[PDB]
Amino acid sequence: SLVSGEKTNFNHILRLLNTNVDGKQKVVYALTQIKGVGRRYSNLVCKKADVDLKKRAGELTSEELERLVTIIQNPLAYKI
Amino acid sequence: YDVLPKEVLAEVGSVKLFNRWSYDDIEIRDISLTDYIQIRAPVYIPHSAGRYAVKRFRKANCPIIERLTNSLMMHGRNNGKKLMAVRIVAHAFE
Amino acid sequence: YTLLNSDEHIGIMRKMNRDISDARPDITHQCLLTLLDSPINKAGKLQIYIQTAKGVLIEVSPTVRIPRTFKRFAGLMVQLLHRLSIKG
Amino acid sequence: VDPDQTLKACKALLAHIKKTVAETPIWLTLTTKKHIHDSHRLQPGKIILPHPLNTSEEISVCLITADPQRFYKNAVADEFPEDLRAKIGRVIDISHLKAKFKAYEAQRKLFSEHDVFLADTRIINRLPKALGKTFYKTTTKRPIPVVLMANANARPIPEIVAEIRKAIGAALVHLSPSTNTAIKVGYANWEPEKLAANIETVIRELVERFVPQKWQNVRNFYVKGPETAALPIYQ
Amino acid sequence: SVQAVQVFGKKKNATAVARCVQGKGLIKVNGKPLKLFAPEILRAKLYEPILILGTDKFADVDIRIRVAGGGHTSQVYAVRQAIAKSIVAYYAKYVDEHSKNLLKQELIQFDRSLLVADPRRCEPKK
Amino acid sequence: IKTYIPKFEDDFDPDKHYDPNRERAELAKLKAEHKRERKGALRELRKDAQ
Amino acid sequence: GTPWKIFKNTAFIKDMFNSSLEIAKFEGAAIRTVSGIRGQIKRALSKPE
Amino acid sequence: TNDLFAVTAGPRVEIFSIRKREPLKTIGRFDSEAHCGEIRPDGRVLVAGEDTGRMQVFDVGQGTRAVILKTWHIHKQPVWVTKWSPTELTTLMSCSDDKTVRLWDLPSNDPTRLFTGHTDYVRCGAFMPGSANSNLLVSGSYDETVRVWDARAPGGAVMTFKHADPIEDVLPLPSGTTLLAASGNA
RNA sequence: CGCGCGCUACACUGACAGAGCCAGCGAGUACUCCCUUGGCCGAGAGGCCCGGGUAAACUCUGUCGUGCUGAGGAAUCCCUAGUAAGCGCAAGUCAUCAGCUUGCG
């Protein structure tokens, strides 16, 4: 009568750099919602940060969320 | 067998539409349309190049799935395509 | 370019002797005002079409709020009849 | 020919270019004194440089094989993950190239997609009429020979990957029936000592491999930039 | 000395040569098998003469077909015409006329276009 | 229902283009007048040639 | 002038006029090749002026 | 004989193979959750109810196929189990989060029968296997009650058993006579 | 300025990546899209080199999912079987036609 619901609160709106609305869609379809970010650009961001395309937005830990917000500031520091 | 896949050699017994569906026990419920819904001559796929628009009431002889396919290819952008329509009929029957 | 009403065209239609009472867009304006302010429109269960004498059939979206004044309504109706659509 | 003249000339030339920001190729213009007639001498070659021409940070190779494309694609899926699978985006047989890519827009999209190209020596005879003129004649992005030659008659796969590693950064050599040619040695963001080393080994390999009746047929090699003047190295 | 029958098949601009000889039971079209050569939905148009006649008639023959011209649909109709006419002509020449007549009757009872190609002329309502 | 405002010009006529930027409207007007004058000149020159 | 594209009979001729106004003036004119082939100016061409 | 079994974990189900034991397909059409991934006794059609209340039924082939046949959004509150009938191919049952278990048929857009009577969350249920037990349903709830219904008379439960614990699991025995209700520490 | 005739754009009939598979008419020692920054050999005119501006369709398998990323009013006209409609490839025939024409599948 006690099973951990530590993951079951995921379908809520996440906040990010510019957009205050970013819900669960996927990991690469959630990156398109930020303005200036493209559909071919969003796949390059995910292959560097060792995040899987299978996961959603909201299935990421408080460490793994911010790793995509540093690398969206400087695309030159991580090679491109 | 000459050259036949396993599904065809399995249903080698009778005439089956799309090699899966039989025509044996099919009853037309209305008495008036038994002449005009043609299930008497069985067909394998609805793509049959038959001249069913030569003269009057010749479309009362082509099989009813061919009628369904030829009426599925009905708008401005689905006009020429027949393999799309027989694929739609196959997927819809599945 | 203005709708043919009984305000200023009373002299033209009275001179050409053809039914001064027929050219009334004010009936359409007040009735469309009634239907857009009615709560069955605000609930969303109302769908409204207009048929004119020329054979023109206009769908009016429930999500529009019309100009309440007849001058702006007449200009909007002229633009609708000539451009076949009004974008928001 | 002494390389000190090449070193002082290329240093003066880099000063002339400068006085991202450069991003211009530097080449040397070969001249010969007699006409070129042998269609086997007209074959495109590669010269392996000691300092390789390509940066290899994000560039994508396209690899053009001849006979089964499924065999070569399975070899790409088989052999090497570190350097090769990040670069080899496409493996196209010549049959699939002549089938799928005949349109101007399609070959323009391929030319804009890939970064550098590699082909086999039994295909680069066919390639200027398979790939378009907008691919081939215009700029430097044009296929380099990789010898994939001994069910396709193929060299063994470690030698294949060794050849592709040698041929990614190699310098392409086209010869022409006329007497003047030009051959790229590097960019202007490079060091002039590396430049002079590249020019020296290119002079050695160009004469003693490609130009026939070698140092009889040689004429002046003038080091040139994109829009600047040429500096002489007689030969 | 060898038993060999060459039969043609025709549609709009798609033509098919089928050479039928004494064999083990294979059917090849352009050097590839019959279960390979077609669009994936028109193979049921190709297998129509085999399923009409049964496989026991095709147990003894080997048919080799070449096709040229037309589109996918015209080539499929040419292949099925060449198959049907080819086995009927082999049974005409090398086994009994009663078997030839039985095969012709079954094929004509299903679809006459397996044996006689009907071209589409231009004669609208004059 | 979230109602919206119908976008329309008050003094409407089919005889006039509507554009906010006078620069783009004036450039399109000059292109149209240049096309009209070029077509008139070509028609007069061709009839004089015949 | 100089031929630009050459079909069986109709050839497009480039380095002769500067504008479609000049061609419309010289419409129907008797043009000639150096070889002796006669011909007639038919129509101004739109896209290369 | 088939080589398919389905395991649902979180917002996706994953149809596994029996022989290869690999994830053969991963279906993540669901918005929020997927609470039981149950495939039909024919073996081509998977039903799964979400946390938003909808249940989606979709065809899977042997390979990567997820074509949606039907969707029902009548519960409007989560559905925890949705089970096929072992004999008929189109009849299925649903125990939702509110109070209801209910019988659906696949062609219809309406639940064919409705059964109420539970007072808490109902979260486990099954059909009754047997030649004589053609249409009987058992479901246990979180109100410490196991109820078995006849599907012919949609009134109350035919039989009811009250336990001491929130009833977590239910299975009937294949003879159709006895039944195991798993509630708490017993 | 007006009128039509063609052409183009306007999203579920979607986009991306692969795999496979189909035509017919077409061969005058004849055909080439510009114009230019530089340098070679050029007393001079030029020639070189390097930069800048056999189908479409169809079939099968995967990856993502409606997102200024909206198929045309009154009228008026045409059309009954290889016809309407989609698609490409080729030619340019003493009149007409490259802003297109006519064939061919």
Side-chain angles (χ1 to χ4, degrees), chain D residues 97-104 106-111:
Chain D
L97 201 144
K98 289 176 74 67
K100 190 180 176 180
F101 296 125
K102 262 306 212 185
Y104 178 89
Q107 63 203 14
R108 207 179 185 193
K109 199 196 180 188
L110 177 133
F111 173 82

Side-chain angles (χ1 to χ4, degrees), chain D residues 141-183:
Chain D
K141 184 146 49 171
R142 80 183 79 182
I144 319 169
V146 184
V147 195
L148 315 179
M149 180 171 49
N151 192 11
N153 276 338
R155 188 170 288 189
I157 45 172
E159 292 186 0
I160 298 284
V161 181
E163 197 62 42
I164 291 159
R165 276 191 211 150
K166 288 182 208 165
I168 276 171
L172 186 131
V173 187
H174 267 305
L175 274 193
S176 314
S178 86
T179 64
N180 193 358
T181 77
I183 170 172

Side-chain angles (χ1 to χ4, degrees), chain F residues 4-18:
Chain F
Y4 306 123
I5 301 102
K7 175 175 85 155
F8 76 109
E9 264 280 344
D10 203 8
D11 287 345
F12 184 77
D13 45 358
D15 304 78
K16 183 57 72 187
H17 321 288
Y18 294 127

